[PDB]
Amino acid sequence: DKKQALLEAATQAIAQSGIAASTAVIARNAGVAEGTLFRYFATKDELINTLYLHLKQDLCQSMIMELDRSITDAKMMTRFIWNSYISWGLNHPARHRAIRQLAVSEKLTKETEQRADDMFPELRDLCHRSVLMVFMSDEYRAFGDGLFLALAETTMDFAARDPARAGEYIALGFEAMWRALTRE
Amino acid sequence: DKKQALLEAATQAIAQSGIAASTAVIARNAGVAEGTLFRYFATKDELINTLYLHLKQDLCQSMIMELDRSITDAKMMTRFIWNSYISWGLNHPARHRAIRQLAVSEKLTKETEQRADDMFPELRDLCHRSVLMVFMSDEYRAFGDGLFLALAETTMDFAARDPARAGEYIALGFEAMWRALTRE
Numbered sequence: 374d375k376k377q378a379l380l381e382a383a384t385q386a387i388a389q390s391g392i393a394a395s396t397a398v399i400a401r402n403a404g405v406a407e408g409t410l411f412r413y414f415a416t417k418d419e420l421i422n423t424l425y426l427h428l429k430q431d432l433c434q435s436m437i438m439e440l441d442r443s444i445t446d447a448k449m450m451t452r453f454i455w456n457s458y459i460s461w462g463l464n465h466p467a468r469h470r471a472i473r474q475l476a477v478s479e480k481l482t483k484e485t486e487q488r489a490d491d492m493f494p495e496l497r498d499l500c501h502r503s504v505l506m507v508f509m510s511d512e513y514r515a516f517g518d519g520l521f522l523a524l525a526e527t528t529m530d531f532a533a534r535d536p537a538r539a540g541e542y543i544a545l546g547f548e549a550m551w552r553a554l555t556r557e
Numbered sequence: 558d559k560k561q562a563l564l565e566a567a568t569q570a571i572a573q574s575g576i577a578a579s580t581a582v583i584a585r586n587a588g589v590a591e592g593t594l595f596r597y598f599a600t601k602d603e604l605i606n607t608l609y610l611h612l613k614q615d616l617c618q619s620m621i622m623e624l625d626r627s628i629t630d631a632k633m634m635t636r637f638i639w640n641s642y643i644s645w646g647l648n649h650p651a652r653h654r655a656i657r658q659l660a661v662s663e664k665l666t667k668e669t670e671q672r673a674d675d676m677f678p679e680l681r682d683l684c685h686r687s688v689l690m691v692f693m694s695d696e697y698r699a700f701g702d703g704l705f706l707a708l709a710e711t712t713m714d715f716a717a718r719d720p721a722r723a724g725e726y727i728a729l730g731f732e733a734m735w736r737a738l739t740r741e
């Protein structure tokens with residue numbers, strides 16, 4: 374049961390300090406010895422990769438469970454998914470900060486990236502139809518993700534601070550993201 | 558001197574933490590007692606607002622010296638301002654970090670903001686022409702700044718980590734920002 378405590382602790386630490394977060398802090402907060410952290414995860418980077426797959430799985434599971442097959446318009450379907458990402462981040466502030474920091478950390482392996490894209494094949498294919506070509510490229514994909522996550526985190530933040538207008542920020546946010554990242 | 562020094566530390570501290578940077582840590586990092594801090598600054602708040610004009614000055618002062626003055630195309634001029642914001646951010650990481658948190662802090666007085674519109678009358682009139690009218694409203698102005706900043710900061714992160722492509726990043730950042738916030 375310690376693995377899960379380590380994951381949850383590293384989720385909290387990274388959400389607060391990014392990938393600079395200390396393994397000693399993560400281990401202690403999970404109620405285990407740093408030496409024990411390292412027996413579950415031979416390297417810090419190994420912890421980073423597993424954590425990312427774990428969080429990505431969670432987020433994906435949540436978007437799949439809200440996915441309405443009746444929606445048939447492509448942009449409308451992209452909006453309902455943005456909404457899900459957003460309410461997911463609203464329900465789990467730490468998980469989203471962590472995921473945002475992990476996703477753009479350059480410490481994710483090729484196989485990790487692959488194994489993550491192949492979790493929700495149809496959601497992956499959807500996004501990829503609308504996304505600007507350069508944001509699909511091996512050189513700039515990582516940056517397109519970065520742009521998407523900065524936009525969703527700001528939307529999350531404004532929604533959380535002033536909930537009376539949450540749905541307005543989420544909607545304005547989606548419309549900003551859609552013009553920024555998608556093709557004509 | 559301890560007045561400016563109490564602003565250096567302030568910048569660092571807010572760069573590390575956030576608007577909640579301990580007014581107590583800011584003190585020793587000036588070589589003074591905490592009560593000395595509150596002597597220069599009525600409250601924590603006034604310190605926030607005062608530092609914000611301070612960092613805004615330095616940013617805008619860097620941003621004014623690069624102004625060509627004779628450019629017509631609104632997008633083109635925005636592009637130089639954006640280019641300037643990023644350089645200043647890459648050159649002064651701590652400062653950008655503090656200005657960034659203060660801008661969305663919600664603690665800046667309206668008076669403080671009107672002081673900012675008075676520092677760079679070339680941007681206020683520029684936004685008054687290109688920016689979606691929703692993001693100029695009073696309810697959504699701060700959101701629209703929050704989205705510009707997130708997008709600028711992401712472009713900066715990627716530019717700093719990958720200098721070989723800093724120019725592509727900056728260029729992709731500006732165009733995503735411009736589609737997100739401006740008229741069609």
Ligand SMILES: COc1ccc2cc3[n+](cc2c1OC)CCc1cc2c(cc1-3)OCO2
Pocket residue numbers: 432451458472476500503504508517518519521522551554555
């Ligand atoms: C959790 O990480 C995520 C999660 C969600 C993501 C969703 C998107 N991107 C990265 C992902 C990001 O990458 C890390 C990149 C570009 C993009 C364009 C889009 C879109 C969604 C996305 O909808 C319409 O156009």
Ligand SMILES: COc1ccc2cc3[n+](cc2c1OC)CCc1cc2c(cc1-3)OCO2
Pocket residue numbers: 635642656660684687688701702703705706735738739
């Ligand atoms: C803090 O200082 C800065 C730095 C520069 C800024 C430039 C802009 N904004 C905030 C400022 C930010 O603070 C809000 C907000 C919105 C905006 C829309 C735009 C734009 C520029 C800006 O060009 C086209 O559409």
